[PDB]
Amino acid sequence: IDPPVIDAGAVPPDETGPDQPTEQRKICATPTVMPNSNFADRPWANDYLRIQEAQKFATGAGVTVAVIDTGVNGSPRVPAEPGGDFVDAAGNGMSDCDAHGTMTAAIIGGRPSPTDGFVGMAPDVRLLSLRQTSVAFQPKGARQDPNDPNTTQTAGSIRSLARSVVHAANLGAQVINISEAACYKVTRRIDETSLGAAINYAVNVKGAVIVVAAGNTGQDCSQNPPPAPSVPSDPRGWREVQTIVSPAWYAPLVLTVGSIGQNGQPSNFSMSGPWVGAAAPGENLTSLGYDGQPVNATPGEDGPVPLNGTSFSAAYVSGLAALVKQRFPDLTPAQIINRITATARHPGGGVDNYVGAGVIDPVAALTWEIPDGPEKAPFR
């Protein structure tokens, strides 16, 4: 496989709604807490990333961040505004039935409280919520041809994602957080032309920074092998890829973010690939729930399960993009992404398939004097 090429002409129409009609599969979910949690303490991510120190330089004021996720149950501390529904034929993105988008939005822009130590990266941003994925709601129709890669649920989500990206760009978002990581085998390619075109439109026509989750391993998402040291022509292991992750693989047009744990090491669930560009805390996280109150778990069969995921990692980096955007308002998306990746805590070898250019360093990103670099990223 090669890096994807973009058909600039194939921008999809600015229309809401799912790719195919959906039905409910599961009861709507509600976040919860781990026993013996202490929300007076700062979340470990806030200390690790030096968020308080970073907020001396910017808060995200004047910046609008689009959260493309499972919807948001808004509150005063997570004051998201409706950005549309791409899962239900009638909705506005302000209904979180999955207990996910709400916590993503709060990591990006959650407001502080006198009664706990939680604050988002960029607490003065405007938040737009577009619901584009859901586990509670799924396509109801059976595929009429099991052999057609373009009728899989994955392909449908890629097509609806493409519309949501155009929609977010047109609503005036300057930063777009995409939680979706559509994974498919390299041997079973999906036609992503509308998605590549939507991304080019959002970034290069509307000037939006797009930050995306690297993806989590699971069913349907299998870890990529590491580069093969004997092929110097292919140091990032493009030829070794077994699983395409999209929109992750549109790097560096987008910034793809992997996850690290408290020990600063790459999370075992973080999807690796030659397109990964940065990393951020993505394990044992704290965020805010449906009333703007601190949560740090979702319910589970054997007990509550901590907040983990590369989408929360991307959220931290989206929040940082918003901080950089306030502080440096004339930088283009490529230049904002350059400040974020250049100032990152780089791994051995400079870059790798797990953390990309390394874990983000908000204070360095807001203060280091570096060359701005080119206005636009090179794309095929």
From Swiss-Prot:
Disulfide bonds join C28-C97, C183-C221. May play a dual role in regulation of ESX-1 secretion and virulence. Acts as a protease that cleaves EspB. This is Mycosin-1. The N-terminal extension wraps intimately around the catalytic domain where, tethered by a disulfide bond, it forms additional interactions with a unique extended loop that protrudes from the catalytic core. It might contribute to the conformational stability of the active site cleft and surrounding regions. The active site is at D69, H100, S311. Residues 147-156 have a biased composition (Polar residues). Residues 137-156, 217-236 are annotated as: Disordered. It is found in: Cell membrane. The keyword Glycoprotein does not apply. The chain holds residues 24 to 403 of 449 of the full protein. GO terms for molecular function: serine-type endopeptidase activity. It is an enzyme of class 3 (hydrolase). Residues 43-366 form the Peptidase S8 domain. Disruption phenotype: Deletion mutant fails to secrete EsxA. Belongs to the peptidase S8 family. Its EC number is 3.4.21.-. It is a single-pass membrane protein.
